[PDB]
Amino acid sequence: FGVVFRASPRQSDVMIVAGTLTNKMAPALRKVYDQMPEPRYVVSMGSCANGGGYYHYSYSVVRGCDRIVPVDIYVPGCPPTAEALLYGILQLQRKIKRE
Amino acid sequence: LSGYSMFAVGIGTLLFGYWSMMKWNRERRRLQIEDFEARIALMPLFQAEKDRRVLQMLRENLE
Amino acid sequence: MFMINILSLIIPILLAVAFLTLVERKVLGYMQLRKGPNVVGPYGLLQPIADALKLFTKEPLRPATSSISMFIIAPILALSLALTMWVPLPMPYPLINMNLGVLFMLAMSSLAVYSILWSGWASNSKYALIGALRAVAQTISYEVTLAIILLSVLLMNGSYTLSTLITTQEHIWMIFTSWPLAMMWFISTLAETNRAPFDLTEGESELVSGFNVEYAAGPFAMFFMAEYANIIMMNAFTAILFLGASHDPHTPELYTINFVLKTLALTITFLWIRASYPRFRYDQLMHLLWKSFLPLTLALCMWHISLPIMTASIP
Amino acid sequence: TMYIAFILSTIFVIGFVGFSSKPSPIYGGLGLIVSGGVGCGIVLNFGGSFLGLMVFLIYLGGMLVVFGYTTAMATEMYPEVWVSNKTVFGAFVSGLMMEFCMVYYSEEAMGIAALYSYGTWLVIVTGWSLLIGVVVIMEITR
Amino acid sequence: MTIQSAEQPHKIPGRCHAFEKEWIECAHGIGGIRAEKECKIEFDDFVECLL
Amino acid sequence: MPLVYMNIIMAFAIALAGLLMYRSHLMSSLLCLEGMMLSLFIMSTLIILNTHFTLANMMPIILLVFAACEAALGLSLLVMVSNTYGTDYV
Amino acid sequence: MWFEILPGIAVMAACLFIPGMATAHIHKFTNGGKEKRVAHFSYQWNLMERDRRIS
Amino acid sequence: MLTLLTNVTLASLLVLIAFWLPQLNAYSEKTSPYECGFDPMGSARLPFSMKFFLVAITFLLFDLEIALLLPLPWASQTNNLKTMLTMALFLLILLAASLAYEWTQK
Amino acid sequence: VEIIFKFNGLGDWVI
Amino acid sequence: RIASFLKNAWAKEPVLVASFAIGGLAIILPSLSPYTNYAIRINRATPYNYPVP
Amino acid sequence: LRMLVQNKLEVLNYTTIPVYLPEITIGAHQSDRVFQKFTELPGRKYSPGYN
Amino acid sequence: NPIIYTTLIMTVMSGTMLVMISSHWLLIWIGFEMNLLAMIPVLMKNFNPRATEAATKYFLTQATASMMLMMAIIINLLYSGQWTITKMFNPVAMTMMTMALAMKLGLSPFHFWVPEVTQGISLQAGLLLLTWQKLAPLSVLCQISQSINPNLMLTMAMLSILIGGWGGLNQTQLRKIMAYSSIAHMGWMTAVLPYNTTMTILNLLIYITMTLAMFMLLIHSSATTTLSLSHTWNKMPVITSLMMVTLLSMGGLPPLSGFMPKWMIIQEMTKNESIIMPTLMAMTALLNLYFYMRLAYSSSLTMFPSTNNMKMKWQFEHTKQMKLLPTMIVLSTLVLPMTPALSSLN
């Protein structure tokens, strides 16, 4: 589909946020999001960081991934099947195409 | 397979290489030297031409 | 109309680096069983231009900490020399008949990496500086052996002019004569170009995209592009220099038809190397060179100095 | 005519104007790069091509790189650009006005091939010299 | 390695071989001192040969 | 003497004055010295190209060698001085 | 399958094919089929020196 | 010189179409240097190593040597090779010798 | 040129 | 016994061994070859310069 | 280091540093005299092998 | 290890012998150049935080000197197309060859590096620096005495003597003083050089013999700072009682050998008329003498108070005798009624 995982945000755009987020971790996340070039996107993934998901009630989680970055598409799952993810990103393209 | 076979094939490739390269290189040396006779035959009248042409330009510019 | 000849040298090659990228993901894909890019093509073919457009369209930030002048001038030099090295290359007829253009290939190749040094210096980042530095280490460390073995394979063609190097291969090919030097030339081209096992400049997982990081959109496209320029170019260079071919002057085109094969046959191999070996680490990368390649390069060098006298076979 | 060799000499001299002024060694390294390519071009114009490519290779392709190492060992935070001090920039202008006042005012092949057969002595002393220079580098760093 | 002439590979002439040759043939037993007097003219023509 | 030579000589004079104005960390001085070296090289080679004084075609490269050689030495001393301070001439 | 790589690679070849042709014929186009002339040495240039004026 | 100019102007053209095109919003912290997320502990300073120059200098003194190796192909055709040949070997021996000396003084 | 010592002037080609 | 540690070095540092091998052999061999006398002789034969009468 | 172990005065070479504290230092008369006395001993006039 | 140290020192000897042999200029500049590389490391033995910047001084000045020299050679070639030594043919070049050599000798006002560098190294490397390094540049000056521009030479030749004086009255630690002694004698060598080289070479031989005498003595006592020298009168009285004499021979008190240089020099220059210059020169040489005398007062003539700790050291004979020494004393002193033999130098 042409998408290719390349490290270092400056050479990348869309961002996947797989897996549970935590408190200490969050500021680094905001850093990385800020250092991306426009037109940056992100993608919340799983029940993980859509809103804490399983770990919704703990002192160290930061509920949704939404509360630190402006998410685009959500891909609910726990884990989402990789294919449901694939439908996710294709849906992302069907959202860029409307840009 | 066997290690001796490796060196054997390699070194044989080398010597065949040196051999053919020797033949061809010598032959090209011959056609070269013949080309040097060619130019060496051409030369003198060019010497004459450049001669007269120089004295010509020198005269003209002097005038 | 020499200008249109030059333009005719520069456009097709850029097209070639683009499609080189695509081939890279293709073959390197099929080594992995997985198919490479495909969906956008139909055979992927349209991809690289979509890629480049994605880059140049994308915002290329000027970093707050970076000095700007070096930061901009480096990519320029990268594509510059990456293209300029192409000029004196006999295909069959060189665009320029340099009396000693091989040595010039070394000159361009040697100013190449300096751009890397600036690329990592002005980038200001920690990863930038460390990666750039180790990069320059491996590079120079390979240019010495590089130039020596190239010398030793050039004692026998006759002279530094390139076209003659065709003439000296009207039969056997150089490679059968001195393949071990061809090995070392190959690997030195495999490291000088900063490729697969000798992977360090990009660093990758070792240093998250190395020196190249802080560059964003366009300049990144320039270093990327120039890198592939050097890869195909050293490949072509090896091709003409170690693999001769029949050449009828009346039909030059025939020769070229052969030549792009013989060089492409090399470039693919780098990709088929990339799919195969883990990278060396900066110690061993220089260890094998200074300890192991080099002494053979010397012994082979005296040997090749000495054949023409013993064989009475002076070019 | 074109005076192209001469204008190359001019760019050369300003290459030393920005170079001899002393604004962090790295930019001076740029100064010798510019002056380097200009140099090889100038000597190329008389057709001693092999030499111009020696300097364009052996010098610039060698030296200024190793200087691109010394600065890694020296640097210091906030290196100065040419514009970053009154004496440095003052110096650069000081060169420009002078040089501007001035403006207001093959044989080689066998020639160097001779080095081996016909000039063994120099080869001896250069060999010996470089060798013991390596020894000196040892006896300093160790 | 000394001198403009003095046998050079493939007998390539110096650009100013002649004035030099004359000027040196002028120079022997005269030795250094008187030589800067008497041989001056030859050296002069050699100078203009050089520059 | 043709103006070009005068220009290179002047580049030497600047390549010296720069060495002697001599300021802050000394690495600049090894640069300025190498620049000086390069000017002498070029000024030599233009001459040997001029009169076809062929044997001397060997000198410039040999010149270059030792000259580069000493500079190659020079950095090493700087290392040592850099080793105890983080260099400055001051 | 793997053969499907080919559309990707052939496009390479033709691109690289172009300069090799494009220069070689431009020479003949300019030189009138004389297939260019190298002049590595002063002498050969002296032959092109004697020439042009002769025509 | 013509091809040099067309190449450099080409590249510079790519630069200018690279910057003056996306036409969007640069701002602080976006422009802050990358450091794998968390902010840098300090601007780049002194990654000192003797192990840099201890070899890199040796590079420089080999490169000077190969500079002398270059005349060789042409020197090979000299009229008197026995006068030459020793030297042709000689430098290489010293090259090797130099290396050898380094090889084992650690 | 009056500086230091005379610079003969004109174009480079002449020599 | 000196032959024995050749087995050792050949077991240990083969690259270097081959290096000394051809590296020395290239020095000793050439004097042996008769062709060498021809080899210099060929370069007497070819005349870049004109043969003045 | 082995060279330093031999020729012991060297290991002693800095132990007679001149700093001139009143308790250590001695006026010239007493020293000239006492050393004049040291020579009086049978084994000290000359190097040991010669005496 | 000695096996490498000796190769360095021998390649220094070679690096000077080469200057003394070759006629071609390029081999001379090679002679100095090889000399340099082989001179720096030997200054770096033992290695001190101090010694390092000593070598930095030395290298930095020698490098720039060699640079100016090569430039002036190239200019000479440009205006005469030669490489043989002989006369130079362009005064603007010639003055620079004189300058470059003026740094290489350390003559004033180029001199400032020499007192400092001497401070930074041990008396072995020191002695060798003040003797062997003085050969080569003189070895070329004798060859270009024919065309020297005497004004330029006598000015540095004098100023070397004044600076070699005034900077000598001021210091305590001996090495810096030895530096000003040598920097002063070089004025006397390079003074007479335009007029008659054989007198130069004579004076050179005496100077080398002398400074060999001193540095062998300082080695023998391991004295350095003046006070450190002061103690030695009680331990091994002889050698202080001999430093007195060799110092006086530096001073050129007339029975002594060191008078032979000056008194031939005064002769030669006097044939040239030039009568005033030697008078000023000879008068200042006195000023040079005076700190040799004060240094004599610290040492042998008077007894500075001994330290107690010295007593144990009395039991222990000095070792590692330096064979060449006694002759270096004696030749540098008693030889005066053997001046005429100087004509052996023709």
Ligand code: SF4
């Ligand atoms: S999604 Fe399933 S796996 Fe991913 S974090 Fe939430 S719980 Fe763990």
